[PDB]
Design a protein around this ligand. Structure first.
Ligand SMILES: O=C(O)/C=C/c1ccc(NC(=O)C2(NC(=O)c3ccc4c(C5CCCCC5)c5n(c4c3)CC(=O)Nc3ccccc3-5)CCCC2)cc1
Ligand SMILES: O=C(Nc1c(OCc2ccc(Cl)cc2)cccc1C(=O)O)c1ccccc1
Length: 550
């Protein structure tokens, strides 16, 4: 069937992407799907289902689902918003219960969704091609979104790890992700790795793929209401349904993956892993190790020879293509771990204070810098700069440019204690900048504060990027950081900890740096568990048992 059909009504609004480029994207994502399954597919599926059978899922109460709703989440068209939901207002709660009852009673009627163009900031690079069109977001009403959490929050948080095990990428912090990749690479006699990029993955997801995902969720121990809600949500929402623009006009119809449903990440991860694990068998790849994050797939295997590796890679592609997962860019075999770009990141190595080797994840900093620039210029709902500091804390660019620049602004605005929202693995987190030393110590280790001996390739990439974007050179940043550090140190408490730990690199005479005693208390239990892209998930960071002296 067609992934999408359009009435012709425009995708109306609500360098950066806008609704004007939405037409160009619609042409790309609108196509008929051709899917052929085989024995490898069926075998992998049964193996996945057997592991899913060990899961016991819980039905979330109305109160629990409401607290998971972001405060700025889209308002319902039924006279209430995210604030009313979080406060457990009578109107919001009564509507949610009516939506739930309707899922238990109605098993067939398609549920309405809103289609909208995403406004994301990308960089002005005219050296190769032109500006990329806006990505599209498809989401149901706020009421349907709360019910999705009640039925599937515990499923989508628990089931992917039980099924895929160590292959589930969202169970890893950036440090654990590097540990997984390095251990996998060094485990092979002669290693070969590749990244597989699917052209419009959400559009390649067929209605059978969605029914197959349900067959996996149905293996959980579920409360009868959860079982019926999952069944009704599959037929009425996940399989497809009608599209409505921001103005209320009928836009068309969807028969592929919705980007803004709770099961988007989980379903995409399961589907990608299933087709890839089956394709690995068809291509007859040796001792495979996979790492899957939604549509992002990386495979580390045992090399069979340059010509053989090229041949097996074409065979994997032909299998993936049959499964309705064709590539955008054809996959390339890599014989260095540092040469693999996975989740827009690559492995690099530095040294700690004692000269010991330390692996970390980095990336080209063009887009993180351009987005941080937009964020200082115009106040945005999500602060990509904060998330980049959290995720890329051990990197040369996040320490010298992002940390320095934003701590100087927070010092000037007297907003260090002010909690800001950032997206990590699709979920929204309300974090206070003062908590950054503690967070970094937990996700990356004490070493992240005393890392040095960066590679020539990494230094040159950071330096070239700064030149290309008109950003002052690294020496200017070291000078600015010494002032930021001094001002922070003088303020005491958590602010001094920010100066001492985050800007230790900026001083000629480096400090000892003992572990931060309060970092243990940080409740990070809901941090590197699962992916919730388009899931509309929110968590405010909390401290467990605070000591009076902290
Ligand atoms: O000795 C030498 O040979 C050269 C020395 C040298 C060169 C330039 C400066 N610039 C400055 O002082 C000013 N800009 C900055 O001190 C500045 C700070 C951050 C900047 C950023 C980002 C960096 C990441 C966090 C968010 C801000 C961008 N740009 C920045 C410029 C350059 C810019 O203007 N815009 C962009 C656009 C896209 C991407 C990055 C940038 C402030 C007043 C006058 C301009 C300072 C020293
Ligand atoms: O979580 C981040 N990005 C996402 C993602 O990460 C995969 C991934 C990327 C880099 C590392 Cl080091 C490790 C894993 C997979 C799915 C969804 C999202 C998302 O957009 O929320 C995110 C947040 C702040 C900086 C950078 C990335």
């Amino acid at each position: 069937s067609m992934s999408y059909t359009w009435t012709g009504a425009l995708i109306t609004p609500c360098y950066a992407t806008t609704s004007r480029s939405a037409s160009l994207r619609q042409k790309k994502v609108t196509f008929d799907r051709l899917q052929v399954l085989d024995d490898h597919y069926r075998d992998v599926l049964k193996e996945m289902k057997a592991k899913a059978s060990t899961v016991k899922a819980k039905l979330l109460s109305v109160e629990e689902a409401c607290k998971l709703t972001p405060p700025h989440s889209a308002r319902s068209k039924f006279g209430y918003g995210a604030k009313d939901v979080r406060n457990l207002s009578s109107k919001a709660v009564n509507h949610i219960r009516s939506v739930w009852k309707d899922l238990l009673e109605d098993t067939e009627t398609p549920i309405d969704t809103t289609i909208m163009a995403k406004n994301e900031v990308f960089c002005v690079q005219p050296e190769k091609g032109g500006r990329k069109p806006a990505r599209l977001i498809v989401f149901p009403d706020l009421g349907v979104r709360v019910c999705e959490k009640m039925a599937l929050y515990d499923v989508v948080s628990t089931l992917p790890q039980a099924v895929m095990g160590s292959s589930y990428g969202f169970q890893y912090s950036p440090g654990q992700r590097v540990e997984f990749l390095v251990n996998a690479w060094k485990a092979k006699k002669c290693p070969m790795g590749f990244a597989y990029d699917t052209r419009c993955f959400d559009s390649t997801v067929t209605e059978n793929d969605i029914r197959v995902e349900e067959s996996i969720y149905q293996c959980c121990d579920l409360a009868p209401e959860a079982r019926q809600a999952i069944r009704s949500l599959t037929e009425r929402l996940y399989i497809g349904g009608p599209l409505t623009n921001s103005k209320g006009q009928n836009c068309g119809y969807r028969r592929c993956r919705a980007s803004g449903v709770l099961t988007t990440s989980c379903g995409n991860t399961l589907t990608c892993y299933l087709k890839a694990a089956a394709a690995c068998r068809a291509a007859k790849l040796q001792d495979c190790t996979m790492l899957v994050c939604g549509d992002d797939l990386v495979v580390i295997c045992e090399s069979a020879g340059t010509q053989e590796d090229e041949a097996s890679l074409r065979a994997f592609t032909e299998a993936m293509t049959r499964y309705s997962a064709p590539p955008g860019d054809p996959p390339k075999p890599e014989y260095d771990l540092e040469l693999i770009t996975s989740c827009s990141s690559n492995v690099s190595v530095a040294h700690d204070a004692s000269g010991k080797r330390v692996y970390y994840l980095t990336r080209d900093p063009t887009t993180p810098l351009a987005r941080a620039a937009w964020e200082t210029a115009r106040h945005t709902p999500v602060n990509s700069w904060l998330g980049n500091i959290i995720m890329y804390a051990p990197t040369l660019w996040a320490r010298m440019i992002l940390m320095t620049h934003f701590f100087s602004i927070l010092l000037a605005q007297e907003q260090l204690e002010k909690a800001l929202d950032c997206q990590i693995y699709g979920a929204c987190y309300s974090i206070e900048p003062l908590d950054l030393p503690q967070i970094i110590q937990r996700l990356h280790g004490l070493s992240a504060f005393s890392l040095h001996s960066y590679s020539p390739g990494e230094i040159n990439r950071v330096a070239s990027c700064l030149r290309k974007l008109g950003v002052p050179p690294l020496r200017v940043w070291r000078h600015r950081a010494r002032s930021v550090r001094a001002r922070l140190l003088s303020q005491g408490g958590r602010a001094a900890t920010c100066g001492k730990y985050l800007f230790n690199w900026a001083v000629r005479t480096k400090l000892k740096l003992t572990p931060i005693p309060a970092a243990s208390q940080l409740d990070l239990s809901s941090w590197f568990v699962a992916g919730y892209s388009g899931g509309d998930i929110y968590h405010s960071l909390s401290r467990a048992r605070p000591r009076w002296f902290m």
